[PDB]
DNA sequence: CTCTTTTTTCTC
DNA sequence: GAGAAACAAAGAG
């Protein structure tokens, strides 16, 4: 559930529920709704989906211009539109009923969260969570990026995973990015040379953008997993130097890299 | 079998 | 700057 995959879901839902009126909201795992499902039911029932935007890995349902629904898929949250009488599968937790169908949210690990936030609190929400700039040449200022990177001793992969220097990078794309920029995941940010930072900054925007267009690496119906150079390729040869991709643990996360291309 | 492995928040 | 917790199932051997 990284920015590429979340953006793919935003567009799918975008062209399938925007403008639809909500008839009622049923929940079998209500606590998932951190702000009180009851309060959410009383307020979104009988509304219209105005739009579905995204910020980092968070989906934002715009229902009426009073409240915004912040949705986060965590590790395996997943939406799907199905028949009104469709049967209830094992890990379905919420359903948004429409006049002609329903939006179902599933999540095996129950990690996912839902939040109803008044329109004016959207920005303070992300600013309170310290979410960095979207991965675009316009919002991802390289200088600020360089500045933050030389001021820290944090290891690169962990630090990128924080969403602070930039938003959207998860385990898959950080490994892809770091390899594409020839930076070892344990390299301390304050040692990075500008040319490295510059290459990193660009590889970030580049790979996340490439992923968006390939529909994300949905192991839905995405094709980015077909172009992964190191994530999960443990034991396979490096696209460039041919060395065997190694897998190690960094800050508790499976980390794939190349011993040679990624020096550090 | 049995153990390992698969986003964000919080406690230090 | 680490570790744990939430939680459930595929994967490895
Ligand atoms: Zn290599």
């Amino acid at each position: 559930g990284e920015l590429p995959e979340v953006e793919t879901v935003r567009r799918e839902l975008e062209k399938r529920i925007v403008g639809q009126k909500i008839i009622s909201i049923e929940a079998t795992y209500p606590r998932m709704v951190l702000t009180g499902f009851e309060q959410l039911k009383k307020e979104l029932t009988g509304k219209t989906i105005q739009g579905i935007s995204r910020r980092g890995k968070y989906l934002i349902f715009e229902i009426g211009d009073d409240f915004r629904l912040i949705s986060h898929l965590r590790m395996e949250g997943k939406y799907r539109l199905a028949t009104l009488d469709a049967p209830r599968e094992k890990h379905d937790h919420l359903t948004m009923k429409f006049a002609d169908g329903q939006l179902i949210y599933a999540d095996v690990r129950k990690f996912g969260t839902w939040e109803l936030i008044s329109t004016d609190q959207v920005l303070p929400y992300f600013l309170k969570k310290k979410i960095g700039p979207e991965p675009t040449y316009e919002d991802f200022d390289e200088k600020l990026f360089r500045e933050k990177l030389r001021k820290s001793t944090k290891k690169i992969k962990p630090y990128l995973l924080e969403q602070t220097l930039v938003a959207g990078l998860g385990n898959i794309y950080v490994d892809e990015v770091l390899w594409l920029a020839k930076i070892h995941p344990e390299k301390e940010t304050n040692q990075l040379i500008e040319s490295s930072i510059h290459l990193l900054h660009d590889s970030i925007i580049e790979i996340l953008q490439k992923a968006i267009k390939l529909g994300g690496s949905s192991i839905s119906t995405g094709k980015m997993q077909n172009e992964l150079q190191v994530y999960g390729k443990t034991g396979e040869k490096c696209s460039r130097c041919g060395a065997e991709i190694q897998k190690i643990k960094v800050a508790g996360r499976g980390t794939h890299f190349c011993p040679v291309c990624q020096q550090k």
Side-chain angles (χ1 to χ4, degrees), chain A residues 2 14 29 35 51 60 63 86 94 114 148 150 157 159 170 177 179 192 194 208 214 221 243 254 259 261:
Chain A
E2 298 172 63
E14 176 83 306
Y29 185 57
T35 50
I60 307 180
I63 329 296
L94 308 166
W114 260 29
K148 288 188 172 177
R150 187 129 45 184
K157 175 172 181 167
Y159 202 177
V177 164
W179 174 86
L192 296 172
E194 332 295 24
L208 296 177
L214 292 184
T221 187
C261 289

mmCIF file of all heavy atoms in Angstrom, chain A residues 2 14 29 35 51 60 63 86 94 114 148 150 157 159 170 177 179 192 194 208 214 221 243 254 259 261:
data_model
loop_
_atom_site.group_PDB
_atom_site.id
_atom_site.type_symbol
_atom_site.label_atom_id
_atom_site.label_comp_id
_atom_site.label_asym_id
_atom_site.label_seq_id
_atom_site.Cartn_x
_atom_site.Cartn_y
_atom_site.Cartn_z
ATOM 1 N N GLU A 2 1.531 1.513 -1.112
ATOM 2 C CA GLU A 2 2.374 2.696 -1.198
ATOM 3 C C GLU A 2 1.692 3.683 -2.129
ATOM 4 O O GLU A 2 0.695 3.341 -2.749
ATOM 5 C CB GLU A 2 3.774 2.303 -1.678
ATOM 6 C CG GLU A 2 4.470 1.347 -0.683
ATOM 7 C CD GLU A 2 5.763 0.771 -1.203
ATOM 8 O OE1 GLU A 2 6.716 1.543 -1.449
ATOM 9 O OE2 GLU A 2 5.829 -0.464 -1.368
ATOM 10 N N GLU A 14 -12.546 6.837 -8.352
ATOM 11 C CA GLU A 14 -12.829 8.130 -8.959
ATOM 12 C C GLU A 14 -13.869 7.975 -10.058
ATOM 13 O O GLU A 14 -14.923 8.606 -10.031
ATOM 14 C CB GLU A 14 -11.536 8.694 -9.555
ATOM 15 C CG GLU A 14 -11.677 9.995 -10.313
ATOM 16 C CD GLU A 14 -11.657 11.189 -9.404
ATOM 17 O OE1 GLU A 14 -12.470 11.223 -8.456
ATOM 18 O OE2 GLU A 14 -10.828 12.095 -9.632
ATOM 19 N N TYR A 29 -17.022 -4.278 11.613
ATOM 20 C CA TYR A 29 -15.806 -4.072 12.392
ATOM 21 C C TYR A 29 -15.634 -2.570 12.630
ATOM 22 O O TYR A 29 -14.562 -2.009 12.407
ATOM 23 C CB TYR A 29 -14.582 -4.627 11.657
ATOM 24 C CG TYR A 29 -13.311 -4.536 12.475
ATOM 25 C CD1 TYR A 29 -13.232 -5.129 13.746
ATOM 26 C CD2 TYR A 29 -12.202 -3.815 12.012
ATOM 27 C CE1 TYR A 29 -12.085 -5.003 14.542
ATOM 28 C CE2 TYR A 29 -11.051 -3.684 12.799
ATOM 29 C CZ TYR A 29 -11.005 -4.281 14.067
ATOM 30 O OH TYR A 29 -9.895 -4.134 14.856
ATOM 31 N N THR A 35 -12.786 7.497 14.506
ATOM 32 C CA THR A 35 -13.570 8.636 14.991
ATOM 33 C C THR A 35 -15.021 8.296 15.357
ATOM 34 O O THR A 35 -15.875 9.180 15.468
ATOM 35 C CB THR A 35 -13.568 9.760 13.946
ATOM 36 O OG1 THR A 35 -13.920 9.205 12.670
ATOM 37 C CG2 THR A 35 -12.201 10.407 13.869
ATOM 38 N N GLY A 51 -15.889 13.876 -4.512
ATOM 39 C CA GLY A 51 -14.611 13.538 -5.103
ATOM 40 C C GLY A 51 -13.706 12.675 -4.249
ATOM 41 O O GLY A 51 -13.887 12.567 -3.034
ATOM 42 N N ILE A 60 -8.821 10.234 0.381
ATOM 43 C CA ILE A 60 -9.702 11.214 0.995
ATOM 44 C C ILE A 60 -11.019 11.283 0.239
ATOM 45 O O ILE A 60 -11.093 11.833 -0.849
ATOM 46 C CB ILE A 60 -9.051 12.613 1.008
ATOM 47 C CG1 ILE A 60 -7.675 12.521 1.660
ATOM 48 C CG2 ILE A 60 -9.916 13.603 1.783
ATOM 49 C CD1 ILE A 60 -6.932 13.841 1.723
ATOM 50 N N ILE A 63 -17.324 13.666 0.733
ATOM 51 C CA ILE A 63 -18.770 13.407 0.760
ATOM 52 C C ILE A 63 -19.407 14.686 1.277
ATOM 53 O O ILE A 63 -19.260 15.003 2.456
ATOM 54 C CB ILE A 63 -19.134 12.264 1.749
ATOM 55 C CG1 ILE A 63 -17.994 11.237 1.841
ATOM 56 C CG2 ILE A 63 -20.421 11.586 1.303
ATOM 57 C CD1 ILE A 63 -17.714 10.504 0.586
ATOM 58 N N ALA A 86 -24.399 -9.082 -2.962
ATOM 59 C CA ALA A 86 -23.169 -9.862 -2.930
ATOM 60 C C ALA A 86 -22.972 -10.371 -1.506
ATOM 61 O O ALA A 86 -23.270 -9.665 -0.542
ATOM 62 C CB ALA A 86 -21.995 -8.998 -3.347
ATOM 63 N N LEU A 94 -16.439 -2.899 6.290
ATOM 64 C CA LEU A 94 -17.333 -1.787 6.066
ATOM 65 C C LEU A 94 -17.868 -1.877 4.682
ATOM 66 O O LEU A 94 -17.232 -2.434 3.794
ATOM 67 C CB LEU A 94 -16.589 -0.466 6.189
ATOM 68 C CG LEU A 94 -15.770 -0.262 7.454
ATOM 69 C CD1 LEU A 94 -14.835 0.918 7.243
ATOM 70 C CD2 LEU A 94 -16.694 -0.035 8.641
ATOM 71 N N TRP A 114 -10.223 4.396 9.299
ATOM 72 C CA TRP A 114 -11.146 5.342 8.670
ATOM 73 C C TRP A 114 -11.317 6.520 9.618
ATOM 74 O O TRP A 114 -11.400 6.335 10.826
ATOM 75 C CB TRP A 114 -12.513 4.701 8.456
ATOM 76 C CG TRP A 114 -12.791 4.209 7.078
ATOM 77 C CD1 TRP A 114 -11.886 3.762 6.158
ATOM 78 C CD2 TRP A 114 -14.084 4.021 6.495
ATOM 79 N NE1 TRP A 114 -12.537 3.301 5.034
ATOM 80 C CE2 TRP A 114 -13.888 3.450 5.218
ATOM 81 C CE3 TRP A 114 -15.396 4.282 6.931
ATOM 82 C CZ2 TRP A 114 -14.957 3.131 4.370
ATOM 83 C CZ3 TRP A 114 -16.455 3.967 6.092
ATOM 84 C CH2 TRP A 114 -16.227 3.396 4.822
ATOM 85 N N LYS A 148 17.605 18.798 4.811
ATOM 86 C CA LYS A 148 17.218 17.809 5.810
ATOM 87 C C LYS A 148 18.149 16.599 5.842
ATOM 88 O O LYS A 148 18.451 16.069 6.910
ATOM 89 C CB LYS A 148 15.779 17.355 5.568
ATOM 90 C CG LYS A 148 14.759 18.416 5.923
ATOM 91 C CD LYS A 148 13.355 17.890 5.867
ATOM 92 C CE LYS A 148 12.380 18.910 6.423
ATOM 93 N NZ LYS A 148 10.972 18.424 6.299
ATOM 94 N N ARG A 150 21.452 16.391 5.141
ATOM 95 C CA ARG A 150 22.788 16.610 5.693
ATOM 96 C C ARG A 150 22.750 16.913 7.179
ATOM 97 O O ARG A 150 23.774 16.868 7.857
ATOM 98 C CB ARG A 150 23.493 17.759 4.968
ATOM 99 C CG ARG A 150 24.950 17.935 5.387
ATOM 100 C CD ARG A 150 25.862 17.996 4.168
ATOM 101 N NE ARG A 150 25.284 18.863 3.144
ATOM 102 C CZ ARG A 150 25.807 19.065 1.938
ATOM 103 N NH1 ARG A 150 26.940 18.464 1.584
ATOM 104 N NH2 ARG A 150 25.185 19.868 1.084
ATOM 105 N N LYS A 157 17.340 4.530 4.048
ATOM 106 C CA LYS A 157 16.071 3.823 3.886
ATOM 107 C C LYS A 157 15.113 4.137 5.049
ATOM 108 O O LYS A 157 14.008 4.629 4.838
ATOM 109 C CB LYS A 157 16.292 2.312 3.757
ATOM 110 C CG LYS A 157 15.002 1.531 3.704
ATOM 111 C CD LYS A 157 15.215 0.051 3.392
ATOM 112 C CE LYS A 157 13.847 -0.644 3.328
ATOM 113 N NZ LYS A 157 13.873 -2.015 2.738
ATOM 114 N N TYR A 159 14.939 6.584 7.124
ATOM 115 C CA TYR A 159 14.513 7.981 7.048
ATOM 116 C C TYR A 159 13.508 8.252 5.935
ATOM 117 O O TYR A 159 12.537 8.966 6.146
ATOM 118 C CB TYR A 159 15.725 8.916 6.906
ATOM 119 C CG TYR A 159 15.428 10.332 7.350
ATOM 120 C CD1 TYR A 159 16.418 11.314 7.360
ATOM 121 C CD2 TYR A 159 14.140 10.697 7.741
ATOM 122 C CE1 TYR A 159 16.117 12.650 7.752
ATOM 123 C CE2 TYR A 159 13.837 11.995 8.124
ATOM 124 C CZ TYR A 159 14.820 12.963 8.125
ATOM 125 O OH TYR A 159 14.451 14.243 8.457
ATOM 126 N N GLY A 170 7.272 3.467 0.341
ATOM 127 C CA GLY A 170 7.040 2.349 1.233
ATOM 128 C C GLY A 170 8.190 1.387 1.012
ATOM 129 O O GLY A 170 9.130 1.708 0.291
ATOM 130 N N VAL A 177 14.084 2.625 -5.400
ATOM 131 C CA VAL A 177 14.704 3.943 -5.470
ATOM 132 C C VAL A 177 16.192 3.896 -5.087
ATOM 133 O O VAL A 177 17.064 4.320 -5.849
ATOM 134 C CB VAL A 177 13.973 4.931 -4.518
ATOM 135 C CG1 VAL A 177 14.817 6.159 -4.276
ATOM 136 C CG2 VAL A 177 12.648 5.337 -5.110
ATOM 137 N N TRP A 179 18.280 1.543 -5.012
ATOM 138 C CA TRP A 179 19.114 0.785 -5.926
ATOM 139 C C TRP A 179 19.344 1.647 -7.168
ATOM 140 O O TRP A 179 20.479 1.819 -7.625
ATOM 141 C CB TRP A 179 18.416 -0.505 -6.332
ATOM 142 C CG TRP A 179 19.156 -1.257 -7.390
ATOM 143 C CD1 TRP A 179 20.163 -2.165 -7.201
ATOM 144 C CD2 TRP A 179 18.951 -1.168 -8.807
ATOM 145 N NE1 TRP A 179 20.587 -2.649 -8.414
ATOM 146 C CE2 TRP A 179 19.862 -2.062 -9.405
ATOM 147 C CE3 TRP A 179 18.081 -0.429 -9.609
ATOM 148 C CZ2 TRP A 179 19.927 -2.223 -10.803
ATOM 149 C CZ3 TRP A 179 18.149 -0.596 -10.995
ATOM 150 C CH2 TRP A 179 19.063 -1.489 -11.574
ATOM 151 N N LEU A 192 25.883 11.650 2.300
ATOM 152 C CA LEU A 192 25.511 11.727 0.900
ATOM 153 C C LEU A 192 26.043 12.984 0.201
ATOM 154 O O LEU A 192 25.926 14.102 0.712
ATOM 155 C CB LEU A 192 23.983 11.657 0.773
ATOM 156 C CG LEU A 192 23.331 10.355 1.240
ATOM 157 C CD1 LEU A 192 21.823 10.497 1.253
ATOM 158 C CD2 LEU A 192 23.763 9.231 0.321
ATOM 159 N N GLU A 194 26.022 15.738 -2.870
ATOM 160 C CA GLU A 194 24.908 16.382 -3.569
ATOM 161 C C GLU A 194 24.470 15.602 -4.788
ATOM 162 O O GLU A 194 23.275 15.340 -4.964
ATOM 163 C CB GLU A 194 25.275 17.792 -4.024
ATOM 164 C CG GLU A 194 26.318 18.448 -3.171
ATOM 165 C CD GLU A 194 25.878 18.707 -1.735
ATOM 166 O OE1 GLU A 194 24.959 18.012 -1.248
ATOM 167 O OE2 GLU A 194 26.469 19.602 -1.088
ATOM 168 N N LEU A 208 8.224 6.500 -8.624
ATOM 169 C CA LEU A 208 6.856 6.549 -8.118
ATOM 170 C C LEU A 208 5.926 6.949 -9.235
ATOM 171 O O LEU A 208 4.750 6.582 -9.249
ATOM 172 C CB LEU A 208 6.733 7.542 -6.974
ATOM 173 C CG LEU A 208 7.528 7.198 -5.715
ATOM 174 C CD1 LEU A 208 7.343 8.329 -4.711
ATOM 175 C CD2 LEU A 208 7.066 5.867 -5.142
ATOM 176 N N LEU A 214 1.972 2.332 -14.358
ATOM 177 C CA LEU A 214 1.883 0.897 -14.554
ATOM 178 C C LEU A 214 0.797 0.285 -13.677
ATOM 179 O O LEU A 214 0.688 -0.937 -13.549
ATOM 180 C CB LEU A 214 3.229 0.243 -14.270
ATOM 181 C CG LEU A 214 4.304 0.614 -15.288
ATOM 182 C CD1 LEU A 214 5.587 -0.152 -14.980
ATOM 183 C CD2 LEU A 214 3.806 0.275 -16.703
ATOM 184 N N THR A 221 -4.667 -5.381 -10.567
ATOM 185 C CA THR A 221 -4.252 -5.542 -11.965
ATOM 186 C C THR A 221 -3.184 -4.497 -12.359
ATOM 187 O O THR A 221 -3.368 -3.712 -13.297
ATOM 188 C CB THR A 221 -5.503 -5.454 -12.919
ATOM 189 O OG1 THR A 221 -5.115 -5.762 -14.271
ATOM 190 C CG2 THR A 221 -6.125 -4.043 -12.884
ATOM 191 N N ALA A 243 25.635 -8.888 -9.937
ATOM 192 C CA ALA A 243 25.847 -9.509 -8.635
ATOM 193 C C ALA A 243 24.523 -10.017 -8.077
ATOM 194 O O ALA A 243 23.456 -9.584 -8.508
ATOM 195 C CB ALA A 243 26.480 -8.511 -7.669
ATOM 196 N N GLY A 254 12.449 -5.890 5.601
ATOM 197 C CA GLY A 254 13.126 -6.654 4.580
ATOM 198 C C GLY A 254 13.713 -5.605 3.665
ATOM 199 O O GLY A 254 13.012 -4.689 3.239
ATOM 200 N N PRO A 259 25.070 -5.512 -3.387
ATOM 201 C CA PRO A 259 26.334 -5.307 -2.680
ATOM 202 C C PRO A 259 27.280 -4.370 -3.407
ATOM 203 O O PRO A 259 27.964 -3.570 -2.772
ATOM 204 C CB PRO A 259 26.900 -6.717 -2.578
ATOM 205 C CG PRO A 259 25.675 -7.554 -2.508
ATOM 206 C CD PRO A 259 24.821 -6.950 -3.581
ATOM 207 N N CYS A 261 26.465 -2.248 -6.615
ATOM 208 C CA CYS A 261 25.904 -0.980 -7.077
ATOM 209 C C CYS A 261 25.601 -0.070 -5.913
ATOM 210 O O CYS A 261 25.734 1.146 -6.015
ATOM 211 C CB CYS A 261 24.621 -1.206 -7.855
ATOM 212 S SG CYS A 261 24.889 -1.948 -9.443
#
